[PDB]
Every structure is written in structure tokens, then in C-alpha cells.
Amino acid sequence: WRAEGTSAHLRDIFLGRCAEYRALLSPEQRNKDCTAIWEAFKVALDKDPCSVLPSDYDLFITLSRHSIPRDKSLFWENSHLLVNSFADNTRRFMPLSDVLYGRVADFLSWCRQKADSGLDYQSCPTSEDCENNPVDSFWKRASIQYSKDSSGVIHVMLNGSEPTGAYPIKGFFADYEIPNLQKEKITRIEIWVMHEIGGPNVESCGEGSMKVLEKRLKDMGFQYSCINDYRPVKLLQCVDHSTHPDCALK
Amino acid sequence: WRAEGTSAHLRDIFLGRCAEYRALLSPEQRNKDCTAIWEAFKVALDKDPCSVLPSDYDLFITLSRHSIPRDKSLFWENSHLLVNSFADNTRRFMPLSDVLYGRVADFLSWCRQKADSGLDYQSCPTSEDCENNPVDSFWKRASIQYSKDSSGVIHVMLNGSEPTGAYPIKGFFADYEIPNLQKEKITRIEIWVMHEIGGPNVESCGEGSMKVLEKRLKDMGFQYSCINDYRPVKLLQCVDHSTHPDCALK
Ligand SMILES: O=P(O)(O)O[C@@H]1[C@H](O)[C@@H](COP(=O)(O)OP(=O)(O)OC[C@H]2O[C@@H](O)[C@H](O)[C@@H]2O)O[C@H]1n1cnc2c1ncn1ccnc21
Ligand SMILES: O=P(O)(O)O[C@@H]1[C@H](O)[C@@H](COP(=O)(O)OP(=O)(O)OC[C@H]2O[C@@H](O)[C@H](O)[C@@H]2O)O[C@H]1n1cnc2c1ncn1ccnc21
Ligand SMILES: *[C@@H]1O[C@H](CO)[C@@H](O[C@@H]2O[C@H](CO)[C@@H](O)[C@H](O)[C@H]2NC(C)=O)[C@H](O)[C@H]1NC(C)=O
Ligand SMILES: *[C@@H]1O[C@H](CO)[C@@H](O[C@@H]2O[C@H](CO)[C@@H](O)[C@H](O)[C@H]2NC(C)=O)[C@H](O)[C@H]1NC(C)=O
């Protein structure tokens, strides 16, 4: 397996994150059983590391699913850390990592040993090793759910400094979220194409892969919008480049 | 009593955070036993909620203590959330909440029931109910250690929009940290007086309580400097006031 093995102390981390997230939920939907959620989740830890399907996580989703506030969904690509810091633990936006079923697995890795009941802390399969590995099947299932439950203004943060372009035609956003957006309950889609401070401007709104994305969203009937270096996020990037000319204040 | 009852699912949260923090420690001191750390901490939970002393957490500290990088300490008052966001989980600085023993308790509450053996989720004592409550004694002990183990350039974030003054003459910083800073291994102390965006400038460097703090530190023989609205932090505050004139980019 050419990927990170199971995360040490997966269970404690999972339950801890789950318990802390409960506090963020509204009292009405605060009734969540972290233990049951973990049990449902571990069904994948009792299977062949190449025989886990997205549907295997259905129970896990049923037990953890909760509503996402209108206009708070934030999708992204090649911007993990920035998205998490900007979202600020649900305070500004609620990306998948800030939704219960996403929060418990953010950054973690897991898979059962090839031919032994115990978890494999040595390595886990990538899409290359095999399509149906625990981690990818999990995110496919969580992505679909996250997309289906989003409504209002859809925000998307992309990385215009990524060498392969801002929009990966083969990725979770393209293959599992866009096709699952409920057109009827979506007002518009606003894209933020961020560039590293002084970093390379590989692509901006309307260029390369951005034209492909825009065309698709438009052919799908969505009201489309694209902003280069959305200020609030630029200001956050600037925190680490205070003396740079792109970050100077008036 | 008068304070919040112990946090729901305290143990799970505690262990979860402990396990996640282990990953941030260098392989040299990563060998931490969260369960044992939890048991040492629990010693205070099996005592009268008004008879817990800072020394009751000596074992807890012994088992969770670790080094703090030179120049990375960050003290503060009236800016807990700003400090946590800026520190960015160990990336930029290492405040007490980003040190193992502080991390497991950041924002939590705890105390045993008055005459019962179980935890009291209804309420916990405050400084007014009785001085020796579990939470206050915990932070006194934790503050002392954090100070004793700090070195190099000392940073301090104060709130200059605080009505009663940026430097509370009575508080954890004045009463438990400053007295435990070890000059022999300290270069200088740098203060950052932050003001709310547009917010009121109650006090700035060299004003009111700031006069007191400066004189106290100088009388102790420390090199001292103060900065109003330290740029990096100002930029972070700006993320939520992007259109405000104080946050306009050049
Ligand atoms: O370690 P773990 O358990 O694997 O958790 C993963 C993993 O540790 C890390 C991957 O970073 P990467 O730069 O490859 O970033 P990606 O390309 O993988 O993320 C882009 C996708 O996330 C979305 O939110 C966007 O809209 C888009 O669909 O982000 C966590 N992660 C958070 N949300 C997702 C996620 N991994 C797959 N997802 C799929 C969906 N939502 C996710
Ligand atoms: O819920 P919990 O478990 O009680 O966790 C507490 C509590 O939930 C919250 C209190 O916010 P407050 O504005 O009153 O701020 P404070 O006056 O209480 O804290 C300011 C002090 O922290 C330092 O780091 C600064 O340099 C300064 O000495 O911050 C958490 N906290 C984190 N570090 C500390 C802490 N509480 C007391 N401390 C004392 C030391 N380090 C701490
Ligand atoms: C946006 O994409 C750029 C380029 O892929 C990322 O910056 C690179 O990050 C890697 C790993 O940290 C480094 O090895 C490269 O040297 C970086 N290149 C450049 C030009 O900076 C950047 O981290 C991405 N931004 C976000 C928020 O994920
Ligand atoms: C700095 O201190 C100010 C003043 O106490 C804090 O602002 C107050 O915050 C409370 C709670 O959110 C509000 O009800 C008040 O209206 C605020 N007053 C003002 C003048 O803004 C502020 O939160 C503190 N800053 C930080 C980072 O903690």
C-alpha cells in the first residue's frame, strides 16, 4: 500500500472529535450517539481493504447526518488547511470538515490488514492500489451527502497556484459533489480562485480549467460567479506575509 | 454553584485532544500516556470541589509536561479566541492552550459533586464560591509550569479595548506568570496591544495599566517593548472586517 497507514489512536480521536462537535449542534439535533456512530463507522474496519464501498457507510451517515445552514456550504480543492482556518470551526462557513460526519475523519487514515482482523498501521491503499479502499469510499459517501444537503449560495475555494490548474476534472468536487447539487434549492455558485502571496498565478477566473468548470456549471443551469483572491481569505493568507507588498495596509 | 457544571463527555474529549496533540510532539517526547495523564488529572475530581490545590495536579503535570520552543511562548489576557486562531495550533506560536497540559483542558469545566462521588454537570464553584475549586487550581498550576518552561523572546497579547484596562493587575498573568518567568533564560518581553476593528482605544502602549506593566517588568530587570496592533494579528482580525477602512489594502 502506497499510503498512510491507520492513524494511531483512531478511536479516541474519533470519539473526542465527535463529542466536541456535539456542542456545536443545535439542541434539537444534539442527540447523537458517538459510540454508535463509531461502531457504524468501523464496519469498514472489518472488511478487505479493497472491498469497501461507499454504501457500507450508509448507517454511519444515517446516525451522524444533520442539517447544514443555508448559504454556509464551502466546497474546495487543493486548499485544505486554508479552508479549515477560514471556516474557523463552523464560525464563518461549514465545509465538510466542519460537518459531523466529516469532522470525525478529517486528516485521518484507516484500513484493516490485508489478511488479518487487526487494523493496518503500516500502510493503506490509494485509488491506485484499488478503487474501493476504506478512505476513498468514505469520502465519496460523505461528499454525496454533503452536496445533497447543501442549499442557498454555494461557495467554492480553489487554488490558482496549483500546477495542474484550479479545477481537477477528476476529483471529489467534479465527480461526487457537482452532480449531487440539488439545483432547485441552490441560489447561485460563487467561486474563489486563490493565489499564494506573490506565489504563481497558474490560473485565474476564466482561464484553463476554470473555463471548463464554468462551462459545465452554466450548461447545468446554475447562476455562476467567480472572484480572484476573495479579500477575506486574502487577508487570512496575509497573516503570514505581513511585510509583503501584496499585504500592505492603507 | 455559580460556574458551569463539568463538560459533557469530559473524558472522551480529554483523551481525544491528548491523542491528537501527541502527533504534534517531536518523536523525542511523543511517548505520552494519555490514559495515565487522564488518571493523574482525575485525582482532583475525587475531592471536595472546594479543597483542590494547584499541587494536586503535580502528577498530571509531571506526566504531560514537555519542552516549549524558544521564542514561541505567547501569554495573553482578554483575547482567548484571537490567541487560539493566531497561534494556529502550534504553527505560529505556542500559547498554553497549545501545550499538552493546557490543550486537554482549554475551554472545559469540571468538578465533583458536593456530597456525591459523581461529577457535577449542573454547576461548579467559582473564585467567589470558594478559592480552591478544581478549575482555578488547575490553571494556576498550569500557568506556573508554562511560565517556568518559557524562554527566549516572550510575547504577550493584551486587549486594548478592554474597558478596565489592557493589563489586569489581578489575574493569571500578573499573579502566576510574570512571577515565574526565569530571567536567566529570557531575552526580552514584547507586548502586543490589540484594539478591536474600529473598536475603542481604551489603552495603548504607555497608557494606564500599560504604564504599570512596563514599570513592573523594567523594575524586574527585563528588556521591554510594546507594539500597538501588531500587524500579523491585525490582519487576522481584519478577516471579519474586510470592507472596514482600517483593513483596506494598499
Ligand atoms: O484523512 P482523510 O480521512 O482522508 O481526510 C482528508 C485528508 O486527510 C485531507 C486531504 O487533503 P487534499 O489536499 O488531498 O484534499 P482533497 O482533494 O482530497 O479535498 C477536496 C474535496 O473536499 C471537498 O470538501 C471539496 O469540495 C472536494 O470535494 O483532507 C481531508 N478531507 C476533508 N474533506 C475531505 C477530505 N478528503 C476527501 N474529501 C472529499 C470531500 N470532502 C473531502
Ligand atoms: O474552561 P477552562 O478549562 O477553565 O479553560 C479556560 C476558559 O475556558 C477560558 C477563559 O477565558 P478568559 O477570557 O476569562 O481568560 P483567562 O483570564 O482565564 O486566561 C488568561 C491567562 O492565560 C494565559 O495563557 C495568559 O497569559 C494569562 O495568564 O480560557 C481557557 N484558558 C486557556 N488558557 C488558560 C485559560 N484559563 C486560565 N488560564 C491561565 C493560564 N492559561 C489559562
Ligand atoms: C496551493 O497550491 C500551491 C502549489 O501546489 C501550494 O504550495 C506548494 O505547497 C507544497 C507543499 O506544501 C510545497 O512543496 C511547494 O513548494 C509550494 N509551492 C508554492 C509555489 O508555494 C499551496 O500550499 C496551495 N495552497 C493551499 C492553501 O493549499
Ligand atoms: C477585547 O475586549 C472587548 C471589550 O470587552 C471585547 O468586545 C466585547 O465583546 C463582547 C462579547 O462578544 C460584546 O458583547 C461587546 O459588545 C464587545 N465590546 C466591544 C467594544 O467590542 C472583545 O471581544 C475582546 N477581543 C477579544 C479578541 O477577545
From Swiss-Prot, chains A, B:
Glycosylation site residues: D33, T62, A115, N159
Catalytic activity: NAD(+) + H2O = ADP-D-ribose + nicotinamide + H(+); NAD(+) = cyclic ADP-beta-D-ribose + nicotinamide + H(+); cyclic ADP-beta-D-ribose + H2O = ADP-D-ribose
This enzyme's EC code(s): 3.2.2.6
Membrane topology value: Lipid-anchor; GPI-anchor
Main location: membrane
Expressing tissues: Expressed in various tissues including placenta, lung, liver and kidney.
Binding, nicotinamide: W76
pH dependence statement: Optimum pH is 6.5.
Organism domain of life: Eukaryota
GO terms for cellular component: extracellular exosome; extracellular region; plasma membrane; side of membrane; specific granule membrane; uropod
BP-aspect Gene Ontology terms: humoral immune response; positive regulation of B cell proliferation; positive regulation of cell population proliferation; regulation of actin cytoskeleton organization; regulation of calcium-mediated signaling; regulation of cell-matrix adhesion; regulation of cellular extravasation; regulation of inflammatory response
Binding site for NAD(+): W76, W139, E177
Localization terms from the record: Cell membrane
Activity regulation summary: ADP-ribosyl cyclase and cADPR hydrolase activities are both activated by Zn(2+) or Mn(2+), and inhibited by Cu(2+), while Mg(2+) and Ca(2+) do not have any significant influence.
Disulfide pattern: C18-C34, C50-C130, C111-C124, C205-C226, C238-C247
UniProt entry keywords in alphabetical sequence: Cell membrane, Disulfide bond, Glycoprotein, GPI-anchor, Hydrolase, Lipoprotein, Membrane, NAD, Signal, Transferase
Enzyme class: hydrolase
One Gene Ontology term of the molecular function aspect: transferase activity
Family: Belongs to the ADP-ribosyl cyclase family.
Role noted for this protein: Catalyzes both the synthesis of cyclic ADP-beta-D-ribose (cADPR) from NAD(+), and its hydrolysis to ADP-D-ribose (ADPR). Cyclic ADPR is known to serve as an endogenous second messenger that elicits calcium release from intracellular stores, and thus regulates the mobilization of intracellular calcium. May be involved in pre-B-cell growth.
Subunit and partners: Homodimer.
UniProt-recorded name of the protein: ADP-ribosyl cyclase/cyclic ADP-ribose hydrolase 2
Species this protein is from: Homo sapiens
Taxonomic lineage of the native organism: Eukaryota, Metazoa, Chordata, Craniata, Vertebrata
Span of the entire protein shown here: 34 to 283 of 318
